[PDB]
Amino acid sequence: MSLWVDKYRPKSLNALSHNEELTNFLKSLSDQPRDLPHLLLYGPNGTGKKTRCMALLESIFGPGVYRLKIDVRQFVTASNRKLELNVVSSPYHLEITPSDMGNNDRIVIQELLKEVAQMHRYKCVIINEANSLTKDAQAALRRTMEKYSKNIRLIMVCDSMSPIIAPIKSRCLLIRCPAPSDSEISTILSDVVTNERIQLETKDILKRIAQASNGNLRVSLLMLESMALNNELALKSSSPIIKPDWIIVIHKLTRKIVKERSVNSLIECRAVLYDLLAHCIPANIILKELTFSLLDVETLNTTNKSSIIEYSSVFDERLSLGNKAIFHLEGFIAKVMCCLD
Amino acid sequence: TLSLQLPWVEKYRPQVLSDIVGNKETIDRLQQIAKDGNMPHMIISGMPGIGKTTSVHCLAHELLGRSYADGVLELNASDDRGIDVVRNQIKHFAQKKLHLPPGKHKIVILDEADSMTAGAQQALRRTMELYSNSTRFAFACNQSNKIIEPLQSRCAILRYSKLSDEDVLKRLLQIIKLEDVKYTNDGLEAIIFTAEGDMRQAINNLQSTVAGHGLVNADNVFKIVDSPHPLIVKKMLLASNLEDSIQILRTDLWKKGYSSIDIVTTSFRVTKNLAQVKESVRLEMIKEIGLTHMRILEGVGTYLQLASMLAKIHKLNNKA
Amino acid sequence: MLEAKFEEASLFKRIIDGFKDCVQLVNFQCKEDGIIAQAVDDSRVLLVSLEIGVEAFQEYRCDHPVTLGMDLTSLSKILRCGNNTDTLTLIADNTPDSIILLFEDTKKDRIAEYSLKLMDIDADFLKIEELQYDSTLSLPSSEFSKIVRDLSQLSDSINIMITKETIKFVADGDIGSGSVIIKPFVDMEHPETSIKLEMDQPVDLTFGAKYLLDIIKGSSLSDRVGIRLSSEAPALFQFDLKSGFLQFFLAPKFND
Amino acid sequence: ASMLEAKFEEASLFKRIIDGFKDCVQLVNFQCKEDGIIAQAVDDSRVLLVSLEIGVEAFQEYRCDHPVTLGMDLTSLSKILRCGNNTDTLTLIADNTPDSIILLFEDTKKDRIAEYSLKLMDIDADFLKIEELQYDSTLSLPSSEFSKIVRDLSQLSDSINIMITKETIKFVADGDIGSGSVIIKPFVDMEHPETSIKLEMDQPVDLTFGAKYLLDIIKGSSLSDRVGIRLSSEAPALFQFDLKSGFLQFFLAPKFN
Amino acid sequence: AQQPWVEKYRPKNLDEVTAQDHAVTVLKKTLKSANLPHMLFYGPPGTGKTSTILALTKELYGPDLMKSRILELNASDERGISIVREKVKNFARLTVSKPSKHDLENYPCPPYKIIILDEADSMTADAQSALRRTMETYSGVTRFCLICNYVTRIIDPLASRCSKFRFKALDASNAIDRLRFISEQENVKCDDGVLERILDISAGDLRRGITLLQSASKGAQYLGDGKNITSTQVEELAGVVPHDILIEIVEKVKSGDFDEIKKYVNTFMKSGWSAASVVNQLHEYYITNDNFDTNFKNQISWLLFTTDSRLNNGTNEHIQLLNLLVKISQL
Amino acid sequence: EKRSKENLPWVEKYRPETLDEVYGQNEVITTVRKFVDEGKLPHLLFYGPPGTGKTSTIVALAREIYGKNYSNMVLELNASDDRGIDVVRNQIKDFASTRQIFSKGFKLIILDEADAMTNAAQNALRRVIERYTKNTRFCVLANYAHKLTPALLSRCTRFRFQPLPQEAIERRIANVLVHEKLKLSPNAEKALIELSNGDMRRVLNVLQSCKATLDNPDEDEISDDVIYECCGAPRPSDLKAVLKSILEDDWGTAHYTLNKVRSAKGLALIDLIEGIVKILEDYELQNEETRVHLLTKLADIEYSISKGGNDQIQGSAVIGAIKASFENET
DNA sequence: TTTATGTACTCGTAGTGTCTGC
DNA sequence: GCAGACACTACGAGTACATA
Ligand SMILES: Nc1ncnc2c1ncn2[C@@H]1O[C@H](COP(=O)(O)OP(=O)(O)OP(O)(O)=S)[C@@H](O)[C@H]1O
Ligand SMILES: Nc1ncnc2c1ncn2[C@@H]1O[C@H](COP(=O)(O)OP(=O)(O)OP(O)(O)=S)[C@@H](O)[C@H]1O
Ligand SMILES: Nc1ncnc2c1ncn2[C@@H]1O[C@H](COP(=O)(O)OP(=O)(O)OP(O)(O)=S)[C@@H](O)[C@H]1O
Ligand SMILES: Nc1ncnc2c1ncn2[C@@H]1O[C@H](COP(=O)(O)OP(=O)(O)O)[C@@H](O)[C@H]1O
Ligand SMILES: [Mg+2]
Ligand SMILES: [Mg+2]
Ligand SMILES: [Mg+2]
């Protein structure tokens, strides 16, 4: 559409120039669609997993997968805590997300799937953000997909499938979606810049865009569009690579941690973290970016880096096992400051 | 089917304020209230078995024996207590016109009042404020912190302490002469040690000893009832060698049919109430014991978890 | 611009007793030929329509069409003052801020005047497609209400299946099952209790119990209720009236 | 063909039977034999024992060639008995080793037929052969008067005491708002044989019963115009509502002194 | 056909349940008798608990009585203490369904029904405490079959009441016959060690092996050359890291140089591999080697154990993998 | 039920019906028999582990007191039924207040599995017990005493059911073998004692499964091989071999031995860990730190096994933990 | 205030039945 | 006899507590 990331998205398996072996595997699966088992696509973020899923649906069902609408279904949990969730439905398939309350994502998996399992001969259900389920929706989904299988099938899209429980991974055909190299990102961006009109001198700037995104199609495409808009559709050799405001704030926090290691610095870090969590930014991604920004500082030796990564792993476990996200991040920053000073 | 004899707990319940033993000052105050008759609103609190509700009943009986049936309303947790079933009944009783002696008032005994709803207490506030000329209230709860602040403001707080060994021993000897049963001093001290200030527990254990063996000696007493597990857990936590604590745990808890969750909760309670060791040591022990408690609660209840908890206790105690 | 006067007060209240639980409120559409009011429930499952002719009114005047968005609880509270001799009267003006209800009695000179404010809905989604139904049966209102509430006492759903000369209602709950069969019969002595069924194709439909209760709550409108059924299509629950009829649009529970 | 066929002249009789004791107890075994359908059920608090008995006379046509036990829920049976009219007839149909019984409803019109099946349930309650020993006071009074007395005295207290001394029936209820006492003499009416109070005196009694159980008993007072109360100081009270062919006995345990 | 090979090749009888022989023979002998106890099936996923209970029901009653004399509950429906009380007690306290003449003549219908409580590990302990005396009281009319994979989530009393049948993990020796039979039935041409490699990749899971075989067969038909499937194809489908990449991992770890390990881990993680498989391959490389002394293996076993236990609780695979590789690098 | 006995599990087929058939808890049985003979039965509280004979003892006691029809004379409440404070206020109050409907004796209230009862229900039960103690006795059966209020524990006499000893299990096994005409080798008997862990129900279940295991239930004797195969438990020889390989040989031999032992008969890793722990408790370890390391590491490993994961990694962790702990010895 | 079941309480309302009256 | 007029039980929504 208006954004270039959604303008040139492929709509078919033959329209993909991203992974040849993966596209061949999907063609093999779509060659015999009747015995298609429940799939589970996992890989790094932004590589095009849902593009693969929609292309596979188009290859199995046909054009009309992308002619999709949104309808709202009313779900009632215990007591009268009314919850509104909208399903992005379509002919030949259904799409659901755990975007409901994390502790109330079980009721949608129960009722909606029991309703659509009522009656070519099957309907496909796509579950985005599948790694965000809370071990109860998955527990229901185990028997939900084991019992009803001749009329409903699942394409479970997720990244970093470790939170997915063992039985679900057992009854799901795991499919791995690797990120492209620099050449493939540069080729896709070049196709974008030749389909549209952008003045460019040396393609090294496209290589820099590919480097900055770190194997991310969405980030690279949005960065290319943003840099073209800022440069008035004339990319320069020394064009400044943009970064998200969150990345700038995280880098400033890392510089503050490295420079000053007092307790007033700790309360300033608490304020910055409070703003970041208040502005719709997940805690685990925050901890990962803070860790890999601290490890990119050249003034630290190997002992400090090893202690930082060890505490990062410990507090990542704590974040995965806890709910108050600010507590574990504050503990991690305090431990890192105590280690460095 | 044969009928059963009355238990010694209820057969020898005191009927006057002189037979009850324990807090001499509180009982003397109750007897002076008995003589005067102007009994104020009172809250009676303490640990179970030290003579809370029997003192209230004795006071009411001596105050108005002829009218105990008429002008005493004994509501309790067994009875339905709420907002309306309390406000209507207590208001009807307090406004009820009954002719007492000049120094007597109707008594509303709220036995086991710590479980009452807060709104019921809010209504009780104005009930006591309005009808204090005719009726008087007498609460009796184990934990006095459940009663709201204004009620404790409009009441006379009477705190009951656990009985010393001397008072329980005196009552035990009195009941022994009344029952004419043989005993040994060792058995009586064992009964006192097992009771831990609870008179009802002492009476129950003494009756069990008499009805199971006939002679109240140390051997029979320890046969029918075991030593309390808080003490064995306390000496398990305070042992020097890790092997000593491990064998104490195994023999005296695992082979005695004690649940692991019970052992962990008892260890937590002892460490909270433990006193000789330093505060930070107790905090660290509580932290690791709570980690073990979480492991037990999640389902992993075995001997190995308890042994590991004891090993961590010793690794903390020996200072690395 | 609207001067509607009922013959007796105990007509429109009797009509809206059925309207009470089927839908919270309706948007009236008063015309010179008749008065209609259609609305959709919260879950878009049950739809209801109303039609009152001029013959039921002693003096009905409608110069221009009038749209009235009104509730039912306050209207029934107003109508609770309807004496067995008192006569209803609906009065409205141009751009009615509030409908004017006036009461007249003959044996007494007392007058009762009541007004109710008009609310807003902003949803007049109307469509009629089906007119032909494969099966058509007529049952007494009391008998139908009794049978459906008896089956609802046993299950949360009611199965209605039609075969040749066998009007069968099937109920299957958790405590057990219940099958009821009634056959058509025509008797000269009591035409009110006569039961007839004309059928073209077999119809198998399973309906919800709550919506059937909402339909039967208006059991006092007609002595005989004509419910006609269609295979693999929504069915209509029609209640007869002297100068019109009231119909209930109910969809099946995913017939297959 | 089916093993058990117990027809009813009218469907209202069996609904009245069930509604008499549907609330006091909810598990019941119906012992169907050649003599009749008899049933004993014990309250959840093991206080009120109901001993139903329907003879072969009360049935239009009855045939039970083999004994069979019928474990039922009275709540489900009551909610499934409402599916009928007063003119309708009833027929309890059961097979051998049944899963359920068929509450097959009929009518004068052959078009009106309604079939209902409620699943049987397994109850292991050993069945007590009550001796019905000699009672000290055997009295019979109209059910309406007893129901009125119980309803008036239940609003006063939670316990009603029945004292039968010197050929005088006396009910007392000492409560919080006050105390009441209803005394009825055992008069005989030659004008009407149903309103006469009858009382047999052997030994005086003093028995205290709960109010809620008395209310549950008088809820089944529509089954007979007169209730015969028999009391004893060492036996549970008996409240026999005689039917056209059997009886509905309520055994109530008095409170401890 | 119209169903995946996992559902297509479910054991219809009790003769088709491989690997597990003790429980299968116990149930087969109990088929003739009527002494079926309350069972507690447990073990790793994919070992065949649901298949075993379905077959046992299938020839206990038959296709007719199976619906009437079975109550199967899952996590797909709410199982709070209220439902586990009322619904389970109501079903148990019913009487058993009456078989027909055909069912009695053919199948040995027992006088009891079975309440299958699958995924019982996810139930609340209060619901299990409610289940205790319901299980104990109505034993003569109903039977309970608790199916879980985590024994510790079942309270001690239910473990006492319920007879325990452990389902062995399906090793490459136990389950080789089943995959051989499936390959023969589906005309799958594979090498000598391909089925053994497929069973080695799976951790006691025949279902995952069947899925891998189905994917390999689908690829073989799509290529259309009619060539035998090799171990490399089923390794690529299974997602296991190639040995050259693992050698690169070991070479990066051995030389220290935190920055080099960090950069190579970034590249390896953008390659999209699953960290659990990487940790498993690192374990089977390091522990089975003879170029490392006892102390190194003693430390690395605990390092891998900690990393795996951390990865089991969700977490971020990148941080865990980098921490594990750095800890190994400093050994 | 249906078809009488012989269609019941051996857990329910061999439930004791007389107080003389309750083995093990000799002191408890003698004390309660003296209580009922002398005519003084206090408020009993039966505490102990599962399967020790608590509900069997109270059922036999009620049957001895009343007779065959004790079920109608006794109000038995369990966690299966709803036991809110409304139940305490109505059902228990009415049963305690009213007289006996079938006899002239006292009322008995059995609160089976009462550790799953709310605090307010126990608070009401305190007053109910004290008020109507003259003609109503309460019996409380519980596995965990920490879920009972201290006042409820004070009001009730506490009887502790100790785990079943050698003699009781042997006597019950002999009775079952006599009834079923079954044979069993003495070493199989010791194996069953080891697998009992104070639980009679486990013994009965294993006996039933082993009778079903034999090709012919007659003229074939149960051996320790049958017990270990049916229960899946590791043999002591296997545990000793695994421990010797771990403690004496290098990593390759230890890993190969553990893998071979696990894959020969499908042994579970948690069973091997429990057996190894039981063996190591008898060791005379020189250092105080070897015990600490062993206990902590093995507890962590068994916790991770309970949560699930990779079996190979956990087995290698077990070998490494044992070897590293025993490296502190010298 | 978030918190996630189960219990207990309180209130309000809707049916459900019975008693007065004409 | 029928329509209210009543008091009654029952169901539903909401709030609060959860170790001493
Ligand atoms: N000080 C005492 N003197 C004599 N008997 C006592 C004394 N304290 C308790 N008892 C006996 O303990 C038994 C019951 O004691 P209660 O006073 O009812 O217990 P309590 O004080 O009410 O504790 P709670 O909180 O209600 S469980 C009776 O047998 C009493 O005789
Ligand atoms: N012992 C077995 N013999 C034959 N096929 C088996 C066996 N175990 C599993 N399978 C296969 O595995 C699939 C069915 O797996 P299940 O029986 O559901 O495993 P499971 O015991 O249910 O594990 P869960 O439910 O995920 S914990 C089918 O494809 C079966 O062919
Ligand atoms: N002392 C014993 N003598 C004989 N059989 C026993 C003994 N203890 C337990 N059993 C057996 O164990 C079976 C079940 O144990 P129960 O006594 O019914 O339950 P329990 O011992 O109270 O355990 P919980 O606490 O209820 S889980 C009985 O049917 C007996 O066969
Ligand atoms: N073969 C391809 N050619 C062009 N663009 C692609 C291709 N594959 C993926 N993309 C880009 O990837 C974007 C979608 O990625 P996304 O589905 O968000 O990945 P993930 O699901 O892993 O987050 C699309 O905007 C599309 O432009
Ligand atoms: Mg007290
Ligand atoms: Mg399963
Ligand atoms: Mg028990």
Author numbering:
A (entry chain E): 1 to 119, 133 to 354
B (entry chain B): 4 to 323
C (entry chain F): 1 to 256
D (entry chain G): -1 to 255
E (entry chain D): 23 to 353
F (entry chain C): 6 to 335
Task: Give the exact sentences the study uses for this entry.
The eukaryotic clamp loader is Replication Factor C (RFC), composed of Rfc1-5, belonging to a large family of proteins involved in diverse cellular activities, referred to as the AAA+ (ATPases Associated with various cellular Activities) family. RFC uses ATP to assemble PCNA onto primed sites for replicative DNA polymerases δ and ε. The RFC pentamer forms a central chamber that binds 3′ ss/ds DNA junctions to load PCNA onto DNA during replication. We show here five structures that identify a second DNA binding site in RFC that binds a 5′ duplex.
In the RFC−3′-DNA1−5′-DNA2−PCNA structure, 5′-DNA2 binding stabilized the otherwise flexible Rfc1 BRCA1 C-terminal homology (BRCT) domain. 5′-DNA2 is sandwiched between the BRCT domain on the top and the Rfc1 AAA+ module on the bottom. Therefore, 5′-DNA2 is primarily bound by the first clamp loader subunit, Rfc1, in a manner similar to Rad24 DNA binding in Rad24-RFC. Four basic residues on the top of the Rfc1 AAA-ATP interact with the double strand region of 5′-DNA2: Lys-314 and Asn-459 H-bond with the phosphate backbone of the primer and template respectively, and Arg-476 and Arg-477 sandwich the template strand, with Arg-476 inserted in the minor groove. The 5′-recessed end of the 5′-DNA2 is blocked by an α-helix (harboring two aromatic residues Phe-552 and His-556) of the collar domain, Phe-666 is precisely located at the 5′-junction, perhaps functioning as the ‘separation pin’ for 5′-DNA2; and Arg-663 in the minor groove appears to stabilize the 5′-junction. The recessed 5′ end is in a cavity lined by three basic residues, Lys-208 of the BRCT domain and His-556 and His-659 of the Rfc1 collar domain. The cavity is larger than necessary for accommodating the 5′-OH used in this study but fits the 5′-phosphate snuggly with two potential H-bonds. RFC stabilizes 2 unpaired and unwound 2 additional bases in the 3′-DNA1, and Rfc1 stabilized 1 unpaired base in the 5′-DNA2. Furthermore, the 11 Å space between the 5′ end of the 3′-DNA1 template strand and the 3′-end of the 5′-DNA2 template strand can accommodate 2 additional bases. Therefore, DNA1 and DNA2 are held by RFC like a gapped DNA with a gap size of about 7 bases.
